[PDB]
Design an enzyme around this catalytic site. Structure first.
Site, short mmCIF file in Angstrom:
data_model
loop_
_atom_site.label_atom_id
_atom_site.label_comp_id
_atom_site.label_asym_id
_atom_site.label_seq_id
_atom_site.Cartn_x
_atom_site.Cartn_y
_atom_site.Cartn_z
N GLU A 47 0.82 -1.21 0.00
CA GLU A 47 0.00 0.00 0.00
C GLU A 47 0.85 1.26 0.00
O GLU A 47 0.55 2.21 -0.73
CB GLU A 47 -0.93 0.02 1.21
CG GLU A 47 -2.02 -1.02 1.19
CD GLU A 47 -3.05 -0.82 0.10
OE1 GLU A 47 -3.02 0.21 -0.61
OE2 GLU A 47 -3.92 -1.71 -0.05
N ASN A 66 -7.93 9.00 -5.89
CA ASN A 66 -8.68 8.07 -6.71
C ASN A 66 -9.52 8.81 -7.74
O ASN A 66 -9.78 10.01 -7.62
CB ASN A 66 -9.57 7.21 -5.83
CG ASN A 66 -8.77 6.32 -4.92
OD1 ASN A 66 -7.96 5.52 -5.38
ND2 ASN A 66 -8.95 6.48 -3.62
N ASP A 80 -12.60 8.71 -8.32
CA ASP A 80 -13.86 9.20 -7.76
C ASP A 80 -13.70 10.42 -6.86
O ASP A 80 -14.70 10.89 -6.32
CB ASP A 80 -14.62 8.07 -7.04
CG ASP A 80 -13.96 7.64 -5.73
OD1 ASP A 80 -12.87 8.15 -5.36
OD2 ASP A 80 -14.53 6.77 -5.05
N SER A 120 -12.05 10.56 -3.94
CA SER A 120 -11.58 10.21 -2.61
C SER A 120 -10.06 10.10 -2.61
O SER A 120 -9.41 10.08 -3.65
CB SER A 120 -12.24 8.91 -2.12
OG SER A 120 -11.78 7.79 -2.86
N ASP A 143 -6.62 8.14 -0.46
CA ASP A 143 -6.10 7.13 0.46
C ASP A 143 -4.92 7.71 1.23
O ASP A 143 -4.08 8.41 0.65
CB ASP A 143 -5.59 5.92 -0.32
CG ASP A 143 -6.63 5.34 -1.25
OD1 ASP A 143 -7.81 5.27 -0.86
OD2 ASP A 143 -6.26 4.97 -2.39
N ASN A 151 -9.05 4.97 3.05
CA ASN A 151 -9.77 5.81 2.10
C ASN A 151 -10.80 6.71 2.78
O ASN A 151 -11.47 6.31 3.73
CB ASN A 151 -10.44 4.90 1.06
CG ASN A 151 -11.13 5.65 -0.04
OD1 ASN A 151 -12.33 5.88 0.02
ND2 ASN A 151 -10.38 6.01 -1.07
#
Ligand SMILES: [Cl-]
Ligand code: NA
Length: 129
Positions: free
Chosen positions: A35, A46, A48, A50, A52, A59
């Protein structure tokens, strides 16, 4: 902060992640490797909208507040920035909620794709724990 492999394993154990929800410590270290490469300050945007955050790339759609993810929740009750601290407490406590959400560690797609079913104990091998 960029953790060493065994350093992160020990910090995760200190915070009660070893065998949490049945997931051995190596699973958690493996997930953090892919990650974030063990970097607490990792972020990823991301498609969309959002974002992380942190060693486990948690997220903002569900888990933390960043003020810029419309319609989202803050189920860990933290600012997303808390997931970037050198102190992993907030990331660990939030990960405990995520892994309890129903799908276990499959919530981390990288865990499913790169750690699940592999010899994850190799990630803690040699470490004084
Ligand atoms: Cl293991
Ligand atoms: Na949010």
């Amino acid at each position: 902060k960029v953790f060493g492999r065994c350093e992160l394993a020990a910090a995760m154990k200190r915070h009660g992640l070893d065998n949490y929800r049945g997931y051995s410590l190596g699973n958690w270290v493996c997930a953090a490797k892919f990650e974030s490469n063990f970097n607490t300050q990792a972020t990823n945007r991301n498609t969309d909208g959002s974002t992380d955050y942190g060693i486990l790339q948690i997220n903002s759609r569900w888990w933390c507040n960043d003020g810029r993810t419309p319609g989202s929740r803050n189920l860990c009750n933290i600012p997303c920035s808390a997931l970037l601290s050198s102190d992993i407490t907030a990331s660990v406590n939030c990960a405990k909620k995520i892994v309890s959400d129903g799908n276990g560690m499959n919530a981390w797609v990288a865990w499913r794709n790169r750690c699940k079913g592999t010899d994850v104990q190799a990630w803690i091998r040699g470490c004084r724990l």
